[PDB]
Amino acid sequence: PNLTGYYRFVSQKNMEDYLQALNISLAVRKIALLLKPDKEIEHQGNHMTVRTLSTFRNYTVQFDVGVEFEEDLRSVDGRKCQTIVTWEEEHLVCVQKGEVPNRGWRHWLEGEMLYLELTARDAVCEQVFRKVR
């Protein structure tokens, strides 16, 4: 599955649980829950760039599938992670090893629908995006 596209926010669920699990303060979560970010993906070979785009903050990550890298998440929750992305069947699976247990995420594609499950500690967030065209 090639994931290149621009994907427009559709919905989210339990994003607050996930933000709490990353130790994000109350004031910052209040605002972050109002963002409705898009995802832009460039997927060429087994290199991917993944952009989370919002009116106030972008977060970008680049990686080769299967190669561990240091992911600078300081603009998100203040941490760095040793991060690895893999293909597990048709799911793109990310484990972000560090201080926070059970931290990572899953993408999968179903037609125009890009699903995203984000996990941290006991928390699970589900986001959905719609591809354009």
Ligand X SMILES: C=C(C)[C@@H]1CCC(C)=C[C@H]1c1c(O)cc(O)cc1CCCCC
Q: Which span sits near ligand X by CB under 6 A: 40-48, 53-61, 62-70, 82-90?
A: 53-61
Q: Is 54 among the residues that bind ligand X (CB under 6 A)? A: yes
Q: Is 32 among the residues that bind ligand X (CB under 6 A)? A: yes
Q: Which span sits near ligand X by CB under 6 A: 38-46, 54-62, 80-88, 106-114?
A: 54-62
What are the start-end ranges of the E strands in 67-112? 69-73, 79-88, 91-97, 104-110
Q: Are 117 and 8 in contact (CB under 8 A)?
A: no
State how far the alpha carbon of 83 is from the alpha carbons of 16, 55, 80, 95, in Å.
Answer: 23, 26, 9, 6
Q: Are 79 and 89 in contact (CB under 8 A)?
A: no
**Residue of 8, 14, 16, 35 interacting with ligand X (CB under 6 A):** 35
**Residue of 10, 16, 52, 108 interacting with ligand X (CB under 6 A):** 52
**Which residues within the stretch 63-102 sit at the binding site for ligand X (CB under 6 A)?**
76
Q: Is 14 among the residues that bind ligand X (CB under 6 A)? A: no
By CB under 6 A, the count of residues binding ligand X is: 13
Angle 98-14-106 (CA atoms, 0-180°, nearest 5)?
50
Torsion angle of C-alpha atoms 93, 53, 110, 102, degrees rounded to 10: 30
List residues binding ligand X (CB under 6 A): 12, 15, 24, 28, 32, 35, 37, 52, 54, 57-59, 76
